[PDB]
């Protein structure tokens, strides 16, 4: 009968092309991954420029100057915090993937801040496994033109779907019907791409409210 629009954010950095001239295969693998990541960000930006009316209304609230920095302020130390919109609407906010933290701290200092020399293949595979989710999110958004249903595992995993069930404004008997039927509350959910502004990628997930 009712939806529950959450906000899922990803910290997306912007890295200029690394001027490294490296013939090592491990350097080239990381450069290929970075060129795939930058192309994913560019394609995600290119997308932005009915059961989705409740999720678009949050996409346009974040279109205001002074609404995405408040969402960043709240998550500044917590992965799941409640923020207040300009309309007074309370919206759960979730930070799933920190790609800015990984790229700025581990990759950039040893690749572009100095002459490139990568000593580990573990970080090549580790980057490939965390950047992989971002590439899949772009693939489901580019094919479906920004609105993805049924809700996939890449957008919202099962571990992070029971977190937005115990944190919902419903009774403890309606959180029993949805925590035991995860595979049914995923075919009736949505995912709307909202914005890439101020180095943050945010999309809205509409989990349903079963009031009957």
């Amino acid at each position, epitope marked *: 009968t009712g939806w529950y629009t959450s906000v899922i954010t990803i910290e997306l950095s912007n890295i200029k092309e690394i001027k490294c001239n490296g013939t090592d295969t491990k350097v080239k693998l990381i450069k290929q991954e970075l060129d795939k990541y930058k192309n994913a960000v560019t394609d995600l930006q290119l997308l932005m420029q009915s059961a989705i009316c409740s999720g678009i209304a949050v996409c346009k609230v974040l279109h205001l*100057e*002074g609404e995405v*920095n*408040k969402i960043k*302020n*709240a998550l*500044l130390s917590t992965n799941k915090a409640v923020v*207040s919109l300009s309309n007074g609407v309370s919206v759960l906010t979730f930070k799933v993937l920190d790609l800015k933290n990984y790229i700025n701290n581990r990759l950039l200092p040893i690749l572009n801040q100095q002459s490139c020399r990568i000593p580990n293949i573990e970080t090549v595979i580790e980057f490939q496994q965390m950047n992989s989710r971002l590439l899949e999110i772009t693939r489901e958004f580019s094919v479906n033109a920004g609105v993805t249903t049924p809700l996939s595992t890449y957008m919202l995993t099962n571990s992070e779907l029971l977190s937005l069930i115990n944190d919902m404004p419903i009774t403890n008997d309606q959180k029993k019907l949805m925590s035991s039927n995860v595979q049914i509350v995923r075919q009736q959910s949505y995912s709307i791409m909202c914005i890439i502004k*101020e*180095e943050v990628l945010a999309y809205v997930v509409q989990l349903p409210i079963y009031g009957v």
Partner: antibody, heavy 116, light 107 residues
Framework: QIQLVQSGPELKKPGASVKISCKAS????????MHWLKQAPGKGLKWMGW????????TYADDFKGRFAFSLDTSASTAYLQISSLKAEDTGVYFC?????????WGQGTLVTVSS | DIQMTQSPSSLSASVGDRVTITCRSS??????LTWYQQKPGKSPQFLVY???TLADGVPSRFSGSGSGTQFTLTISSLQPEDFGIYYC?????????FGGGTKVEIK
């Protein structure tokens, strides 16, 4: 390591114009918009509005309309402030600011002095 | 427009005092407050991210607490390196308004 470098002081006449530049180096200029903050002489701080560094559409506060216009050149990574039809209290210090995680990040001071 | 005010517009503490600087608001702002420390003839650097989080590079002596329509900035123990004019500015919604400005003097 985000840096906002601004212009220097100017000394003008009532009716002249002042062109204040604010160069933002350290981040992709398209992401964050530019906010302008006027300090009154001896008084508190005033907030005029922001200029979107992606589209270029400015918005002003109800007190700062009529003589103030924001402009920018996205290729040079600079933000421009032009004051036309000058008067004698436009004087003070002018700041260019961008959003940090919450509060503002402020530029330096470009004192504007109106003589007679 | 949410309008802010500060009670101790002229504060003069000693070198070992614990002072409180407060703000009100005409409207309700949900834990969206920041404090600036404008040195005399320079640019105002913030000290607090949200009303209960000190900024990076800011001494832990600075701390804030409050939500709704009443806030407070607390200095655990003053030191001579910290003196200036303090402003508290909401960023809930536009236009943003600053406080009257507290000139923390020295006793």
């Amino acid at each position: 390591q985000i840096q906002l470098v601004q212009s220097g002081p100017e000394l003008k006449k009532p009716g002249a114009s002042v062109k204040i530049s604010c160069k933002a180096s350290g981040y992709t200029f398209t992401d964050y918009s530019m906010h302008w903050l006027k300090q009154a002489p001896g008084k508190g701080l005033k907030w005029m509005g922001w200029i979107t560094t992606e589209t270029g559409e400015p918005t002003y506060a109800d007190d700062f309309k009529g003589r103030f216009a924001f402009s920018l050149d996205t290729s040079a990574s600079t933000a421009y402030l032009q004051i036309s039809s000058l008067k004698a209290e436009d004087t003070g210090v002018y700041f260019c600011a961008r959003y940090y995680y919450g509060p503002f990040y402020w530029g330096q001071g470009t004192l504007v002095t109106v003589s007679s | 427009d949410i309008q802010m005010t500060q009670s101790p517009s002229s504060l003069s503490a000693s070198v070992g005092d614990r002072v409180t600087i407060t703000c009100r608001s005409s409207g309700n702002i949900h834990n969206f407050l920041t404090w600036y420390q404008q040195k005399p003839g320079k640019s105002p650097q913030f000290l607090v991210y949200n009303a209960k989080t000190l900024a990076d590079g800011v001494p832990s002596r600075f701390s804030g607490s409050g939500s709704g329509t009443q806030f407070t900035l607390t200095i655990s123990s003053l030191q001579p390196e910290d003196f200036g004019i303090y402003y508290c500015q909401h960023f809930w919604t536009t236009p943003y308004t600053f406080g009257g400005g507290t000139k923390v003097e020295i006793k």
